[PDB]
Amino acid sequence: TEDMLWTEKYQPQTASELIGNELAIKKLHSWLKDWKRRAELEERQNLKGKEEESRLCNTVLITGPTGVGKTAAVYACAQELGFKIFEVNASSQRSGRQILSQLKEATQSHQVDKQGVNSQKPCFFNSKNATSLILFEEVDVIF
C-alpha cells in the first residue's frame, strides 16, 4: 500500500539526518545560513526604508562521487533554512537564452508569494519568507 521509492521515503529532511561528510554539510549549511541572514537583513532594510570581510561568495560548488548525497544535503539544508530551490537538471532543455530569460528574475526579483506552500521546491523546464536559491544539477553534463 506504498507508492514511494525508499530513497524518497527515507529522504533526509534535516542536515543532521545525512550520513557522513559532516564537514561539507556544515560548510554548506553555514553558507546557506549566511545567505538567509543576508536576505533577512535585506528585508529589515526594506522595512526601515519603507564585502571582503564577510567574503560571502554568491555561489557554492559541490563535488563528489555518485550517490553520496550532494543533492540530498542541498535539499535538506534548503528545507531547514527556508530556501526555495529552482532546479535546472540535464533532463530538460537548458540552453543559455532559455535559462537566462526564464530564471534570472528568480535571483533578481522578489518572490510574489512568500508565505504558504511555497516551501515546495519546483524544477525548470521549457518544452515566513522564502528566499530563492538556484540549483544547477549535474553541471558537467553539457549537450
Half-sphere exposure in the Cβ direction for 77 (13 Å, CA): 22
Sole window of 11-19, 28-36, 80-88, 93-101 interacting with ligand AGS (rule: CB under 6 A): 11-19
DSSP letter at 101 equals H
Q: How far is the CB of 22 from ligand AGS (least distance, A)?
A: 10
DSSP letter at 23 equals H
Residues with Cβ within 8 Å of 59's Cβ and at least 6 positions away in sequence, in order, are none
61 vs 112 by CB, closer to another protein: 112
Whether 76 and 12 have beta carbons less than 8 Å apart is answered as yes
User: Which option in ligand AGS, Mg ion, another protein, none does residue 23 bind, with CB closer than 5 to 8 A by kind?
Assistant: none
Sole window of 36-44, 65-73, 82-90, 101-109 interacting with ligand AGS (rule: CB under 6 A): 65-73
Place of cell 521549457: 126
Task: Confirm or reject binding of residue 71 to Mg ion (CB under 5 A).
Answer: yes
User: Which option in ligand AGS, Mg ion, another protein, none does residue 113 bind, with CB closer than 5 to 8 A by kind?
Assistant: another protein
Q: Of 65, 128, 74, 136, which is closest to residue 107 (Cα–Cα)?
A: 136
The annotated binding site for ATP is made up of: 64-71
Footprint on this chain of ligand AGS (rule: CB under 6 A): 7-8, 10-12, 18-20, 66-72
